[PDB]
C-alpha cells in the first residue's frame, strides 16, 4: 500500500555501482585483523618513495640489463655533454618506467605534481669534478650547448657532494609536450693515479607531496 | 588536480570485473553433465594479478555477480542454482551429488529473466590477512621425502568455490553461459613490493622466462632523446 | 658495542633505519618463553667477496641461523617462532675503490626458476636456492631478483645504500613481519636480505680485487615460545 | 511517485539471507514459553564438558566396544610404554570422536583453543605406581624413550592421586600437523596379594574456556 | 579465533535447507490428481535430524520457501496455490475438496514467473516446547488393550501440513516440480543429550541396528599411532 | 537511484497477510458510527454466559 514507481535504469548491472548485497555467510565471523607493520592507504605513498631511474636505457641484452640503472662519467670526454634524462613526464614510456612512480602512472591517465630526482655519484673518494644539471621547460627545445643551458634553470654539481645534489622540477601536466632535464660536463673527470678513470652514477627519482593522479586505467602487459 | 581520493586502496581495487565464465552447452565435450565447479580465482581478471601483487599481505570482502544468458545473449525461461561451497566442505562431483542438498553450502536460486544474482563473500582466510607470497612450506612437519611442489603454495588463501547447475532432475532445454563478476569491497594492503617485471608463466609461483626482458628501451643512445 | 660475550667494532653514529617505522616488540597476545641471554649476542656470518663480476647475494631469515647458532637450538626445538632482527652490513674498502651496494629487506622473498623453449615446463627451486643457510646464495638474474620482480623499485623495502666513496656500513632493524603472530622456524622464511651491486666494483690494477662484505646480525626481541620438541 | 531502481540480485533466493516474511497465521498466539531447567545458548558450553575419550580405539567387535573407553595398566609390562593418545586435534578422526567435543568439531571446519584431559585411575585402593604423561608439540616427532620424553613437557602421575592428574595442552590449530600426548610407564604396577594384577584407566577430555569454532559444515554420516 | 557468535544456537540451525520436493507430473503413477499433501518434516533435510536430537526440548519459528519449476528447470506460465492446513483442520483428499476453499486454511497464490513464495510458520505446539523424545504414551487413559505402537509418538509436535496444487478447474498444461525449503528462525534448545551413534532405522523412534558399529577405529593397536 | 533488491516471496498472495491497499472510494465518508447498546469485542464474553 506504499506508492512506488520504478524509475528508468532499474535491473541494470553497472560494475562501478557501489551498493550492498546479501551476505553469503551471515554468521561467519572472520579472524580479527591483527597488526602488520607496513600498511598502505594511498598509492601516493609509493609515488613519493625514490626508485632507481633507468636513464641509461640503451642496452637490451639479458646479461647487460644492469647497465640500465647507472650511466657513466669518465676522463675521456671533457666539457662535453653527458646524458639527457627523458622529459619530465613520469607516465610516458622510457626511463621513467623503471620507477615505481612510472608503473603506477600507467594505472592512471591524468596526473599533476612536482618530482624530485636525486643523483648518486659512485666514483672513488679521491675523484672530483663538476657536472652541470639544467632543466629546460616544455615547448622550448633542448639547449644547444652548456653555456646556453646555463642561462636557464640549472644546478652546479661538484663532487664535494657525494649524492646530495637533487633536482626539483616545478610542474608536470597532460596536454615538446613535457620538459626535459639534461646533464652536462661542466668540468672533466679528474683523478689521481691508482684511481679508476671511469665512474658510474645512479639516478633516483620520486614525486613530491603535491603529486596526484586522477582518472584510472588498467594498462598492464601481463596478463 | 586537487582531490586525492582517486588514488586510495579502495578506489584502486573496487570495481566489478569479469572474473570467470561457466559454460553449460546443450551438447559438447566441455560440460556433458550440465554443471561446473569454479574455484574463486582473483587472477581470473587479467590485470588483477599484477595489481594485488604490488603488496604482500591483503584483506578484503568480495561481491560476486552472475550475468547469465545463452551464447547469443538471449534470455530464456531457465532456473539456475548457484551454490557456494566453503573451503572446508567438499565440492560436488556428480549432478546428483548430496553436495547440492547440504545446507551449510549456501545456494542461490535465480532465473535468467531475473537480474544477475548478487551475493557478498566475507574474508575467508583463517589467517589475519591473505598472502600472495609464501617463502616456505604450508605443513609444520619434518615431511621432506616427496617432490616439494608445495613451495609458494598457501592453502589458507582458499576463498571457497561456486557451483553452477541447471535446476531440475532432467537436463536443461536451453544452451546456457554464466559469467561471473567479482568486486573487491573493504580493502587493506600491507607490505609494498615492486610491480611485476616479466610475464607470468604459472599460477601459484612467480617463475619467469629463461630470457629476461625490460620495461622499455626507446632511447637508441643515452645522448640523444 | 658489546652485547654479551660478543664484541664488534663499528660506527655508532651512522644512519640507522627501522623497517617500516616499527621496532621489534614482544607478543602480548594469546598465540603461545622469552630468551635474551646467549640468544642476544652478535652472530657474524662468514665474509663474502665483493667483486667486479659479482651479481649479488641474498640470505633467508630465520633460516640463516637454523643450524649455525645457539639461536638455532631454540628454533629447531620449538614448533613456534617469533623474532625481530638487527642487521648490520659493513664492507671495508680503501679510498681508491668504487662501488654501490643496495642492502634491502624484502619480506616473503619467493625465488623463481626459469623455463625457456617453445614449451615452458619448469620445476620448483631446490632447498639450496630456497633456504641457502648462512652461506647465502648468489642471484642468477639480479635485474629481476630471480622472481620477475624488478630491482629498480627495491627501495620500497627497508633499504640502505653502501657507497664506498661515502658509506662503509648499512644498518637495518627489521620487526617480526607476518600474517600470523607466531609461525614456524624451519618452514617459513619471514623475509630475505638482499645485498645487490647497482654500481659495480672498479679499481686500477694492483689493488685488492676483493672488498670484504661482513654481515653482523643479532635478534632484537627473540620470542620462541611453543613447547620443547 | 518515489524514485527506485532495482539493484542487481533482486529476485534471488539465498538460503543464508536473513530476512523477514509474512506470517502464515498472524493472529495465532503460541503457548507462552515456561521455564525448562537445562538450556543451551552456545555449543561451546557442550564443548567444555568432559566426555569419555576412546583412547583404546582397537577393538571393533560389537560385544567388545566397551573396551574402547578404558585402556589397561598391568604388572606385566615394566618401565615400558603404555599408550599414545592421538594428536591434539579434536576435529580429526580417531579417539577424539568419542567425545562430544569431537562430534561437534565435525560440524565446523576451523577451531582454536586449549583442551583439558583428565585421566581416571580405577584400580584397587591398595594399588600404587607412577605413570609418566608427556605432551610433545607438533612438528617434533614422538619421543623415542621415556627419558627423552621427560626432557620435554611432562607430568609425573602417582597413584597417591586417584584421578586428579589432568593434562592441559596449550594450543590447537588447523594448518605432524598436530601434537600428540603419550603416556609412559615410569614405574611398574605394584600390588599386594589379593589385589588384581591388571587395572584399567579411563580418559576424560574437554575444552577450556578459550576454545572456539568458526566456519560451519554439516558432515554427518546419517542420514 | 576471537568471535564466538559462530557457535550460537541460532547461527547453528538458522539456514534454509531443502526439506521436501512435490512432484506434479503431466502423466504418471505418482500424482495423477495434480496435487499433493506434504506434512512438515524437519527430518526432510538429512543432517537436521541428528542435529536437533542433540537436545530434547526445543522451540522455533520456521520460514518456508517454494522453488518451483519444470523438471528441466524451465519456468512456465502456471498459477500455483500453496495451502497451509493447521494441525486441527483436516487435509484435502480430492482435488475438488472443500478444504481448498476453507479460509482458516491460509493459502498462497503465486506464479512460477514470480520469485519463490516465502511465508513464516510460528511455534505450533500446544506445549511450551517441541519434544523429539517422549518416554511414554500420549493418551492419559488406562487404554492398554491394543498394539502399543504409540511409544515414542508425540502428536503435539505436529506443525501442520502444506497442500500444493495447480490452480484451475482443468488439469495443468505443464509438468511441474515444487521444492520446499525450511529455515529455522528464533531457536531455543534445552536439555543436551549425546549425539546419535548408530544409523537411523525409522522415523518416529530411535531404534538401531542388530549389529552395533563405532565412530572410528583407525588405530590398529593402542601403542602405535 | 535508491538501491532495492526484491526478496523472495514478492508477488505472493497470502490470505492471512495483514496489509493495507488502495481505497476504491477515497472521498466517500461512511455514516458515523452511533451507539448500539450490546457490543462484543471478544468471543470469550459469549463463552462465559
The three cell numbers locating residue B142: 619434518
According to DSSP, residue E177 is labeled E
CA dist list (Å): F45 to A1, D52, D137, F34, F38 = 34, 59, 74, 22, 12
Q: How far is the C-alpha of C173 from the C-alpha of C179, rounded, in Å?
A: 19
In chain A, whose CA is at the least distance from the CA of E3? Answer: A29
Residue (of E85, E81, E93) closest to E39 by Cα position:
E85
The 8-class DSSP code of residue D125 comes to: S
SS3 of chain A: the string is CCCCEECCCCCCCCCCCCCCCCECCCCCCCCCCCCCCCCECECHHHHCCCEEECCCCCCCCCCCHHHCCEEEEECCCCCCCCEEEEECCCCCCCHHHCCHHHHHHCCECCEEEEEEEEEEECCCCCCECEEEEEEECCCCCCCCCHHHHHCCCEEEEECCCCCCCEEEEEEECCCCCCCEEEEEECCCCECCCCCCCEEEEEEEEEECCCCEECCECCCCCCC
Please tell me the distance from the alpha carbon of residue C164 to that of residue C212, in angstroms, as a whole number: 12
Experimental technique used? X-ray
Residue E11, phi-psi category: left (phi > 0), alpha (psi -120 to 50), beta (remainder):
alpha
| Nearest CA-CA distance, residue D141 and chain C, Å | 7
Least Cα distance to D121 among D158, D181, D163 occurs for: D163
User: How far apart are the C-alpha atoms of A112 and A124, rounded to whole Å?
Assistant: 38
Q: Is the dihedral of CA B144, B145, B151, B155 positive or negative?
A: negative
The rounded radius of gyration (Å) of the Cα atoms in chain E is 21
How many Å apart are CA C6 and CA C9, to the nearest integer?
Answer: 10
> Any CB–CB contact under 8 A between F35 and chain E?
no
Contact criterion met (CB < 8 Å) for A23 and B12: no
- In sequence order, the β-bridge partners of residue E18 are E181
| Contact criterion met (CB below 8 Å) for C175 and C111 | no
What are A136's strand-pairing partners?
A180
CATH topology for B1-225 is Jelly Rolls (2.60.120)
Classify domain C1-229 by CATH number: 2.60.120.20
**How many Å apart are CA A16 and CA F44, to the nearest integer?**
61
**How many CB atoms within 10 Å of residue D192?**
9
Contact B126 D141 (CB under 8 A): no
Angle, alpha carbons D147-D151-D157 (nearest 5°): 70
Tell me the nearest-neighbour CA distance from C227 into chain D, angstroms: 6
Collect all residues of chain C within an 8 Å Cβ-Cβ radius of residue D141.
229
**C-alpha dist (Å) from residue B119 to B112, B162, B176, B183, C38:** 16, 11, 21, 10, 55
CA distance F13 to C198: 76
Chains that touch A (3 or more CB pairs under 8 A): B, C, D, E, F
Round to whole Å and give the CA distance between A171 and A173: 7
Provide the Cα torsion E87, E91, E97, E103; round to 10°.
20
Domain ranges of chain C: 1-229
Residues in chain B: 225
CB environment A128-152: b (16+ within 10 A), e (fewer): ebbbbbbbbeeeeeebeebeebeee
Q: Is A162 on the interface with C (CB under 8 A)?
A: yes
Q: Which residues of C touch D210 (CB under 8 A)?
A: 30
**Surface-to-core class of residue A38, CB atoms within 10 Å of its CB (0-12 exposed, 13-18 middle, 19+ buried):** buried
Using CA atoms, how far apart are residues F43 and D36, in angstroms rounded to an integer?
32
B122 shares contact with chain D (CB less than 8 Å): no
Backbone torsions φ then ψ of E52, nearest 5 degrees: -70, -20
Determine which helix (DSSP H) or strand (DSSP E) holds E11, and give its type and residue range: helix E9-13
> Taking CB atoms and an 8 Å cutoff, what residues of chain D touch A17?
7-8
Label residue A116 exposed, middle or buried (CB < 10 Å: 0-12, 13-18, 19+): middle
Size of interface D-F (CB pairs under 8 A): 45
E163 alpha carbon, distance to own chain's centre: 13
Domain boundaries, chain A: 1-223
Neighbour subunits, E (≥3 Cβ pairs < 8 A): A, B, D, F
- Judged by CB atoms closer than 8 Å, whether chains meet at E72 and B113 is answered as no
**Of the candidates D62, D63, D83, D64, the residue with the CA atom closest to the CA atom of residue D72:** D83
List, in sequence order, the alpha helices (H) in D57-105. Answer: 100-105
Asked if A126 and A164 touch (Cβ cutoff 8 Å), the reply is no
Residue with cell 562430544: D100
Which residue pairs, CB below 8 angstroms and at least 24 apart, start in C112-119?
C112/B205, C112/B206, C112/B207, C112/B208, C112/C146, C112/C147, C112/C148, C113/B207, C114/B207, C114/B208, C114/B209, C114/B210, C114/C140, C114/C141, C115/B201, C115/B207, C115/B209, C115/B210, C116/B209, C116/B210, C116/B211, C117/B210
| Strands in C37-145 per DSSP E | 43-50, 57-61, 85-91, 100-107, 137-138
3-state secondary structure of B12: helix
Yes or no: say if A165 and A159 are a contact pair by the CB < 8 Å rule.
no
8 Å CB contact of E115 and F9: yes
Interchain proximity D152–C30, CB inside 8 Å: no
Q: For cell 623453449, what's the residue?
A: C117
Residue of A nearest to F7 (CA): A22
Query: Which chains contact C through at least 3 pairs of Cβ atoms less than 8 Å apart?
Result: A, B, D
Q: How many other C-beta atoms are found inside a 10 Å radius of the C-beta of residue E44?
A: 18
Question: D13 vs B110: CB contact, 8 Å cut-off?
Answer: yes
All three cell numbers of A51: 626508485
Domain range A1-223, CATH architecture: Sandwich (2.60)
Chain D hits for A29, CB-CB cut-off 8 Å, are 214
CA distance D46 to D206: 9
- Give the whole-angstrom CA distance, residue A71 versus residue A52: 12
Contacts of C99 in chain A (CB under 8 A): 122
Neighbours of C150 (CB within 10 A): 25
Do residues B16 and B184 lie in contact, with contact meaning Cβ atoms separated by under 8 Å?
no
> How many Å is the Cα radius of gyration of chain B?
21
Query: Which is nearest to E117 in space by CA: E44, E167, E49, E172?
Result: E167
Residues E201, A162: Cα–Cα separation, whole Å: 87
d(CA D197, CA D129): 12
Positive or negative, the CA dihedral E123, E128, E133, E136 is negative
Asked if D153 reaches chain C (Cβ–Cβ under 8 Å), the answer is yes
Give the C-alpha separation, D194 to E140, whole Å: 55
Angle at D13 between CA D12 and CA D19, to 5 degrees: 110
Q: Which residue has the cell 573407553?
A: D69
- How far is Cα B143 from Cα C186, in angstroms, rounded to an integer? 12
DSSP-assigned letter for residue B7: G
Q: What does this entry list as its resolution, in Å?
A: 3.8
Task: Detail the DSSP E strand segments found in chain C.
Answer: 2-3, 6-7, 17-18, 43-50, 57-61, 85-91, 100-107, 137-138, 159-163, 169-174, 191-199, 211-218
Q: Identify the three-state secondary structure at position F4.
A: strand
Amino acid at each position: 500500500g506504499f506508492p512506488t514507481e520504478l524509475k528508468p535504469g532499474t535491473n541494470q548491472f553497472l560494475t562501478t555501482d557501489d551498493g550492498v548485497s546479501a551476505p553469503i555467510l551471515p554468521n561467519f565471523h572472520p579472524t580479527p585483523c591483527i597488526h602488520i607493520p607496513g600498511e598502505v592507504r594511498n598509492l601516493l605513498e609509493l609515488c613519493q618513495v625514490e626508485t632507481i631511474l633507468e636513464v641509461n636505457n640503451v642496452p637490451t641484452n639479458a646479461t647487460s640489463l644492469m647497465e640500465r640503472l647507472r650511466f657513466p662519467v669518465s676522463a675521456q670526454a671533457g666539457k662535453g655533454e653527458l646524458c639527457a634524462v627523458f622529459r619530465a613526464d613520469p607516465g610516458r614510456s622510457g626511463p621513467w618506467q623503471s620507477t615505481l612512480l612510472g608503473q603506477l602512472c600507467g594505472y592512471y591517465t591524468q596526473w599533476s605534481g612536482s618530482l624530485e630526482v636525486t643523483f648518486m655519484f659512485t666514483g672513488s673518494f679521491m675523484a672530483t669534478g663538476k657536472m652541470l644539471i639544467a632543466y629546460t621547460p616544455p615547448g622550448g627545445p633542448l639547449p644547444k650547448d652548456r653555456a646556453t643551458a646555463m642561462l636557464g634553470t640549472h644546478v652546479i654539481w661538484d663532487f664535494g657532494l657525494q649524492s646530495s645534489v637533487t633536482l626539483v622540477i616545478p610542474w608536470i601536466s597532460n596536454t615538446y609536450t613535457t620538459g626535459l632535464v639534461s646533464i652536462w660536463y661542466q668540468t672533466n673527470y679528474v683523478v689521481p693515479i691508482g684511481a679508476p678513470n671511469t665512474a658510474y652514477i645512479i639516478a633516483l627519482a620520486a614525486a613530491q607531496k603535491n603529486f596526484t593522479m586522477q582518472l584510472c586505467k588498467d594498462a598492464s602487459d601481463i596478463l | 588536480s586537487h582531490s586525492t581520493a582517486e588514488t586510495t586502496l579502495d578506489s584502486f581495487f573496487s570495481r566489478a570485473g569479469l572474473v570467470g565464465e561457466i559454460d553449460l552447452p546443450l551438447e559438447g565435450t566441455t560440460n556433458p553433465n550440465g554443471y561446473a565447479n569454479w574455484d574463486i580465482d582473483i587472477t581470473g581478471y587479467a590485470q588483477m594479478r599484477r595489481k594485488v601483487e604490488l603488496f604482500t599481505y591483503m584483506r578484503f570482502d568480495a561481491e560476486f555477480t552472475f550475468v547469465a544468458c545463452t551464447p547469443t545473449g538471449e534470455v530464456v525461461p531457465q532456473l539456475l542454482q548457484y551454490m557456494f561451497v566453503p573451503p572446508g566442505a567438499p565440492k560436488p562431483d556428480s549432478r546428483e551429488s548430496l553436495a547440492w542438498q547440504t545446507a551449510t553450502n549456501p545456494s542461490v536460486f535465480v532465473k535468467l529473466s531475473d537480474p544477475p544474482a548478487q551475493v557478498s563473500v566475507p574474508f575467508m582466510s583463517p589467517a589475519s590477512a591473505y598472502q600472495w607470497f609464501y617463502d616456505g612450506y604450508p605443513t609444520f612437519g619434518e615431511h621432506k621425502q616427496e617432490k616439494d611442489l608445495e613451495y609458494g603454495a598457501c592453502p589458507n588463501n582458499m576463498m571457497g568455490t561456486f557451483s553452477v547447475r541447471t535446476v531440475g532432475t532432467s537436463k536443461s532445454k536451453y544452451p546456457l553461459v554464466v559469467r561471473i563478476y567479482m568486486r573487491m569491497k573493504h580493502v587493506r594492503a600491507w607490505i609494498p613490493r615492486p610491480m611485476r617485471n616479466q610475464n607470468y608463466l604459472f599460477k601459484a609461483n612467480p617463475n619467469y622466462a629463461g630470457n629476461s626482458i625490460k620495461p622499455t628501451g626507446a632511447s637508441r643512445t643515452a645522448i640523444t632523446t | 658495542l658489546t652485547i654479551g660475550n660478543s664484541t664488534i667494532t663499528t660506527q655508532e653514529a651512522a644512519n640507522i633505519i627501522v623497517g617500516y617505522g616499527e621496532w621489534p616488540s614482544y607478543c602480548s597476545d594469546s598465540d603461545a618463553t622469552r630468551p635474551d641471554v646467549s640468544v642476544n649476542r652478535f652472530y657474524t656470518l662468514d665474509t663474502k667477496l665483493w667483486e667486479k663480476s659479482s651479481k649479488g647475494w641474498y640470505w633467508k631469515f630465520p633460516d640463516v641461523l637454523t643450524e649455525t647458532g645457539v639461536f638455532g637450538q631454540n628454533a629447531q626445538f620449538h614448533y613456534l617462532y617469533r623474532s625481530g632482527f638487527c642487521i648490520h652490513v659493513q664492507c671495508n674498502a680503501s679510498k681508491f675503490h668504487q662501488g654501490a651496494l643496495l642492502v634491502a629487506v624484502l619480506p616473503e622473498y619467493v625465488i623463481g626458476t626459469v623455463a625457456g623453449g617453445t614449451g615452458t615446463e619448469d620445476s620448483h627451486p631446490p632447498y639450496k636456492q630456497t633456504q641457502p643457510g648462512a652461506d647465502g646464495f648468489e642471484l642468477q638474474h639480479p635485474y629481476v631478483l630471480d622472481a620477475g620482480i624488478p630491482i629498480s623499485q627495491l627501495t620500497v623495502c627497508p633499504h640502505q645504500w653502501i657507497n664506498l666513496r661515502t658509506n662503509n656500513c648499512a644498518t637495518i632493524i627489521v620487526p617480526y613481519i607476518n600474517a600470523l603472530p607466531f609461525d614456524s622456524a624451519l618452514n617459513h622464511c619471514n623475509f630475505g636480505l638482499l645485498v645487490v651491486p647497482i654500481s659495480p666494483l672498479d679499481y686500477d690494477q694492483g689493488a685488492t680485487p676483493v672488498i670484504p662484505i661482513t654481515i653482523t646480525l643479532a635478534p632484537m626481541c627473540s620470542e620462541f615460545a611453543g613447547l620443547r620438541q
